[PDB]
Symmetry: D3
């Protein structure tokens, strides 16, 4: 039994894909443990969430985008939930995300990619404490 | 523009229809303005929410059901959101709800009926203040 | 609790709508109690099923159509299953069936209309005994 | 057999509902007989199409909207295609369109209402000649 | 042209996924040759079906589960139907089943995995004779 | 930013999958630049489109099939659209097309495979000029 942190990103709201994305995780039988809606996430929370990317050239564009619209943060719970939800998510790169995955079916940009999911046990605990302190 | 208060009821979680219900409202182009996940709503908020029914025969069963599992409270915003979302919802009575509506398509009980929606401008304001003080 | 008799008609097989139709009933929370696949229903069961129509102008065409491909006979169970499933089904006449209903959404002919559902408690009992003796 | 003229309006493109709308008509078993994609319809065809409204208060806004993005013009064919597709479409007014219909499920504005469908045999013939001379 | 044996397992019934699963195979254009509904399969039929697993530690839990609710057995027919339906099915292990497959989208347990499909020509003939003697 | 040429093949029309296929590309956020409906494509256009296959044993059966019903030709535009739409398409061979892809979910024949998509930059320019001279 693991908990992972999911963000529904502003592009999901703009494109009306919130339910589509949440439904894919719901149908896989993962349960919501916590959920928070953000009309606009504070930029500092975004910078902490993406602290590992602070020196990447895309960091500021990434942060601008993540504050461009609403976000839903969700803690999902289930056996091996972290790796399983990552697999549903699909690869970051639109050249690689597989059809059948969320990004593979729905995303067409490396930045505007609809959804975040924690990539490891270590980062799950981290991100959960950022969004649900 | 109006805002209306929607509850996603515990039967929706039980039957994995949370995204299905939210998706129907999303596809109608209504926007989430506020949202709260409750692992178990406090009985007092429930009795307040349904205060008009407090002397009805079904009141205790209704309150019991509403705390029997998680709920999501959502404020939706759009032109004539109250009446329009009531129409999507469908009649309380499974003998009356029209196919095409949430309850008409998905609910088969007068109590376990998946979704609450505010029925008027005043009750909307009222319910919004209960779930989002 | 009632039980009603449903037939999935040969046009549903032809048009690959078998799961679509069964799915609408399933999502309404009705339970399969009995089920039979017929690669070709015996003409005699069909004439019995539709005995009320035996003197109508359309009778032979109706019987011919009903043996023109496979059918599935299903007994569904739930509260007020008969009337409720009739409502999902929709009007026989394509000029009358409401969007949201099976026929309203999917059928475009008064004969090739995808689904049979028992129309009363007595006809349900009757039809159930024909298809599941 | 009748033929009717359908326009998929620019809001459908904006909201990525082109296939959703065409799919509802396709599932009803109506056949495309003619089809034209317009990156931007010529204003003159639009004013001709809506000539009956030329003196109405909303005319300029309607014409402006109709050239604000792409449209698809389609001629559909089937028994009673005109009235049947009008029924799928739903009422122009978002306070009136029934869930189950295209507009009832998907539109939330009296102007930005996703789809045009010919309203009579004569207007069908008329509109067909405008979009497919 | 091959025939393969599919079981819709009790968890599909509990979770109301019967049509969803059958629809996926139907949409791939496989035809039903035989179909049998079982309110509860006899435990001995289950033990024969899984005779190859008799010495596995999960054998009794597996059999208990397979008699815990209804089952539908289906013989599907089509070119290379055995391998193709296996690929739609997805891997047994929730850590491996690919999004886009039945288990990959819908199953989250190695035991409660919704669907059985024969794994070879040799086992297809075998299983078909168990369920359709 | 690339443009690729897509054909919706006659089997999509016969099976009523036109919207399903177009919707998959639409949901991935690709935009239509040009679209042409063909009640029946001229055989010579088909032979040019498939000129690379002229010496294959399946060439004449392929051409017969492509003129057996309507076709929609579409020019889609987007970043890396050629390779991305190929990946959504899925492999030609029903033994290999992956679930989640168009062919993987929907096609069951190596010839009747629903959709063409240009395989390279060189062939995109070529095919676009054949269908949209
Ligand atoms: C690698 C990369 C990421 N990003 C953005 C989008 C990613 O969701 C976010 C974090 O990157 P990363 O953690 O690599 O992606 P993922 O979300 O798949 O774990 O940074 C870019 O905008 N451009 C890039 O090249
Ligand atoms: C009228 C009624 C309501 N209820 C429950 C279900 C309703 O969702 C809740 C409030 O009733 P009500 O406000 O009448 O219905 P709605 O939810 O359609 O606005 O009380 C019953 O259980 N039995 C009943 O007879
Ligand atoms: C009334 C009628 C029925 N039929 C066929 C189609 C009906 O499904 C079948 C039985 O008719 P009926 O019991 O009146 O319709 P329903 O199936 O809605 O209960 O007979 C015709 O072909 N033409 C007709 O005019
Ligand atoms: C009546 C009306 C129409 N319109 C626009 C939207 C309609 O699609 C278009 C033509 O009106 P109309 O033909 O009355 O509606 P429909 O599209 O349902 O046949 O004009 C308005 O913007 N406001 C209005 O009050
Ligand atoms: C391998 C395995 C199977 N099972 C159950 C679920 C499987 O559907 C069933 C048969 O196993 P197997 O034939 O290996 O799986 P599949 O259904 O993918 O062909 O046994 C377990 O409960 N635990 C296990 O570790
Ligand atoms: C390879 C092959 C193709 N075809 C037909 C179907 C293909 O869509 C068409 C062109 O072949 P090809 O370009 O190899 O396939 P794709 O469409 O995946 O790029 O020729 C056959 O009928 N049989 C075959 O063995
Ligand atoms: Mg990461
Ligand atoms: Mg109320
Ligand atoms: Mg009848
Ligand atoms: Mg009009
Ligand atoms: Mg096996
Ligand atoms: Mg090719």
């Amino acid at each position: 039994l693991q908990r992972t942190l999911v963000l529904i990103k502003p592009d999901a709201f703009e494109r009306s894909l919130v339910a589509e994305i949440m439904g894919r995780i719901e149908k896989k039988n993962f349960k919501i443990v916590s959920m928070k809606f953000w009309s606009k996430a504070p930029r500092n929370l975004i910078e902490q969430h993406y602290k590992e990317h602070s020196e990447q050239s895309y960091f500021n564009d990434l942060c601008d985008f993540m504050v461009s619209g609403p976000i839903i943060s969700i803690v999902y719970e289930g056996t091996d939930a972290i790796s399983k939800i990552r697999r549903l998510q699909g690869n970051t790169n639109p050249l690689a995300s597989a059809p059948g995955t969320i990004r593979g079916d729905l995303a067409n940009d490396i930045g505007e990619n609809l959804i975040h999911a924690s990539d490891s046990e270590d980062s799950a605990v981290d991100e959960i404490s950022i969004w649900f302190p």
